[PDB]
Design a protein around this ligand. Structure first.
Ligand SMILES: Nc1ncnc2c1ncn2[C@@H]1O[C@H](COP(=O)(O)OP(=O)(O)OP(=O)(O)O)[C@@H](O)[C@H]1O
Lengths: 594, 159, 31
């Protein structure tokens, strides 16, 4: 390599000013790895070259990285490895790149392919839904002759070097080298690496409807494994690459494609459209916005700026979405620290409107729509052979609902399969099944949001208020709040309605989502010896006034009456259970029961 | 010029703030506006209100997304770029910015842009969902009268 | 063979450990 190395050589003296600002960063991350591990009684090798600093004073060295990125990456590795030992070697893994920056119109949505930038750089976004296995793989073993006591050294290349077209080495353990020594190999002195195949869908909103969502796939490496949950808005960028032999294999390969498009990539980025950083300024404003004695009322009407009223409902959603704690019993069954509300209403009264705008501020809570299929909380042994001979229990919809919220529609308009499905997973936090394989108790902290319609028209006043839809009352007993939405005619109400549907054809949301996702990580009081005294007076009267009124209650309803006020103090962001929380919890039930 | 195109281009906005406290409020009770408060400002008053004092009333807060986040994006590849969704008029907004502030740094970076963008529009001039034509939005006066030049010149040149 | 069959100069052998297994005759009388 003489002439193919001089521009590689010229880069080695060039970009040392580009990491004038990173030559500290490359060594400072590993001196504490030489100090955490030496004093136990941890980070990968990630070197974020900004594209700006390379673009700012180089053109020919820059232009090749977006035209022919197949001769130019093991240059930048080769300078980088010798600037690690020459920095630090005295205390007694090639430091590959990450390559973040901007790109200038390479946001190819994989519904579209390339015709010109094949084998180039490409930025790709979307959602992943495949999440296949994890499995190690060698790169190099170290043979050893026991007789004469001397080692050997051999590398085995694969489709993981990403750029060079190496002659493959399909050998597993080449034994008996040119000697008479029965060979050994110190596998602890060997080295290994892993693979993970994941397919990415299309974000199904900016793809115009003339096709179903397509998909491609990406092979990544050790640094970013177990990072992507199924259901994350991910952003990845790597090289484009074809492999395999096709079309001109030995015989009879007619009308068979032979170029598997792959991506060998880096820098998997989550996005939000957990990463929400905040300075001292905005964290102090929410302390200043924790100060007033009205913030539970201001946050209620600042949520859905299209619909009038229902402030009992509008407080309930924000009370539910932030959620309450579950103190797990030591050597005992934890109770239902989740909360599960329900709605029902005579039709076209926005009972389904507010169920889907919670999904925009979901904070990684992707819900379904409730289609009559088994798979709501199971797998039913879908394996697809897991690349020829492995069986996996691929999770349907409970790997996503953990510490999140879901919502489903048309409860009464289902078959019998979901009725036994929501039976177990409500009284029990988990599910366990051996469909065709093994029992496995995988856990899930989830909470439903319901919606249903009464069958017999406008009959919610002339008949029994209970037994009203006759879906099994085990679920009615396992839920608490059954709001009956009224739509009676008031001549000032509909007059006010008539203008608010006209002024919608043209204190804020991102501050709201930051508030709850900061208040999910602070303290939990649970304790005031007199706030617990007022609520039992506030229950035993209606425990004697349950059959003399419309609805009978149960003993588990007492666990609601702590749980609502428990999260109501989380709105206050205080380590004390106050007294004022035992007044909102009273009258909210008093509207749900009278 | 009776300004048929640009006073609407001067109908656009700026986020900015103050240095003093004035009871002149039209934006709503509590007429003295407290100082150092971020206020959306139209071009016409705010172009000269950052002039009249020594120390002027308003504070020029630069919309630095027009100064760092896209200045590298326009540095990359000026063949397909958002000149449009960030500014419905990039041009005179870049002009009237550079008079009051007079920064020679970005005075270079659009001098490279306009010849490269027009390098399309000459050799692209021989003869769709919600907004997505907008790549061809701030080019309308620029080339369309040149398009009628090449149209009629063929029509005399043929029969 | 050629092509990197000569290994690195490893400072850790087993013969330096082998004689430190031969010392595991009767010397540890405590336990
Ligand atoms: N009570 C209401 N107040 C204000 N707007 C309403 C109300 N009810 C309905 N709307 C308007 O109706 C539109 C959609 O209503 P929506 O489709 O959610 O009814 P729905 O809840 O689906 O009824 P159902 O679930 O019985 O079909 C919204 O744009 C909303 O503005």
């Amino acid at each position: 390599p003489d002439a193919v190395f001089g521009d590689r050589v010229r880069r080695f003296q060039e970009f040392l000013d580009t990491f004038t600002s990173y030559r500290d960063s490359v060594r400072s991350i590993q001196v504490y790895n030489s100090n955490n591990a030496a004093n136990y009684n941890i980070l990968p090798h990630r070197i974020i070259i900004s594209l700006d600093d390379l673009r700012e004073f180089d053109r020919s060295f820059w232009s090749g990285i977006l035209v022919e990125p197949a001769y130019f990456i093991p240059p930048a590795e080769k300078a980088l490895t010798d600037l690690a030992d020459s920095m630090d070697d005295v205390p007694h893994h090639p430091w590959k790149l990450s390559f973040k920056g901007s790109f200038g119109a390479h946001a190819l949505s994989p519904r579209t392919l390339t015709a010109q930038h094949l084998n180039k750089l490409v930025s790709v976004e979307g959602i992943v839904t495949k999440t296949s296995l994890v499995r190690p793989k060698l790169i190099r073993s170290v043979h050893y002759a026991a007789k004469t006591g001397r080692f050997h050294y051999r590398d085995y290349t694969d489709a993981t070097t990403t750029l060079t077209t190496r002659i493959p080495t399909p050998a597993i353990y080449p034994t008996e080298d040119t000697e008479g020594n029965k060979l050994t190999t110190e596998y602890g002195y060997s080295t290994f690496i892993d693979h993970q195949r994941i397919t990415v869908q299309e974000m199904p909103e900016m793809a115009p409807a003339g096709q179903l969502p397509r998909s491609i796939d990406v092979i990544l490496d050790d640094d970013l494994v177990d990072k992507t949950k199924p259901g994350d808005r991910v952003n990845v960028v790597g090289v484009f690459k074809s492999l395999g032999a096709g079309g001109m294999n030995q015989s009879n390969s007619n009308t068979l494609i032979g170029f598997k498009t792959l991506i060998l990539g880096n820098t998997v980025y989550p996005l939000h459209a957990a990463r929400q950083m905040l300075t001292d300024f905005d964290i102090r404003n929410i302390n200043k916005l924790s100060k007033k004695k009205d913030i539970f009322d201001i946050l209620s009407q600042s949520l859905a700026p299209s619909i009038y009223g229902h402030d009992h409902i509008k407080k309930a959603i924000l009370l539910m979405l932030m959620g309450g704690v579950e103190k797990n019993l030591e050597n005992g069954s934890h109770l239902r620290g989740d909360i599960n509300i329900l709605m029902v209403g005579d039709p076209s009264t926005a009972k389904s409107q507010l169920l889907r705008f919670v999904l925009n501020t979901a904070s990684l809570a992707i819900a379904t729509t409730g289609r009559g299929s088994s798979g709501v909380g199971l797998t039913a042994a879908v394996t697809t052979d897991r690349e020829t001979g492995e069986r996996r229990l691929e999770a349907g919809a409970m790997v996503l609902a953990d510490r999140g919220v879901v919502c489903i529609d048309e409860f009464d308009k289902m078959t019998d399969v979901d009725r036994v499905a929501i039976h177990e997973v409500m009284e029990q936090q988990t599910v366990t099944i051996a469909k065709a394989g093994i029992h496995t108790t995988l856990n899930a902290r989830c909470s439903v949001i319901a919606a249903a319609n009464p069958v017999f028209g406008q009959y919610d006043v002339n008949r029994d208020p209970h037994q009203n839809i006759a879906l099994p009352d085990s679920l009615l007993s396992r839920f608490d709040l059954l709001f009956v939405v009224t739509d009676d005619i008031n001549e000032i109400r509909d007059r006010s309605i008539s203008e608010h549907v006209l002024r919608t054809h043209r204190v804020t949301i991102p501050f709201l989502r930051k508030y709850v996702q900061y208040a999910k990580e602070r303290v939990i009081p649970q304790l005031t010896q007199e706030a617990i005294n007022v609520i039992v007076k506030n229950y035993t009267d209606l425990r004697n006034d349950d059959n003399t009124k419309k609805s009978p209650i149960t003993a588990r309803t007492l666990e609601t009456l702590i749980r609502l006020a428990t999260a109501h103090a989380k709105v206050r962001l205080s380590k004390t259970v106050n007294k004022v929380d035992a007044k909102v919890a009273a009258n909210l039930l008093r509207f749900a029961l009278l | 010029y009776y300004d048929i195109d640009d006073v609407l281009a001067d109908g656009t906005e700026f986020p900015c703030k103050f240095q003093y406290d004035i009871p002149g409020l039209g934006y709503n009770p509590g007429r003295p506006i407290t100082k150092n408060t971020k206020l959306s400002l139209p071009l016409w008053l705010a172009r000269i209100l950052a002039i009249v004092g020594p120390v002027p009333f308003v504070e020029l807060l630069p919309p630095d997304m027009f100064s760092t986040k896209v200045m590298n994006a326009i540095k990359t590849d000026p063949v397909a770029l958002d000149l449009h969704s960030i500014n419905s008029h990039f041009f005179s907004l870049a002009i009237k910015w550079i008079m009051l502030f007079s920064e020679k740094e970005l005075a270079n970076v659009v001098s490279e842009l306009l010849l490269q963008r027009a390098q399309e529009l000459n050799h692209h001039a021989s003869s769709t969902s919600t907004f997505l034509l907008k790549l061809e939005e701030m080019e309308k006066e620029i080339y369309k009268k040149s398009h009628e030049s090449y149209k009629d010149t063929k029509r005399w040149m043929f029969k | 063979m050629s092509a990197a069959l000569p290994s690195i100069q490893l400072p850790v052998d087993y013969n330096n450990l082998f004689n430190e297994i031969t010392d595991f005759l009767v010397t540890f009388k405590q336990d």
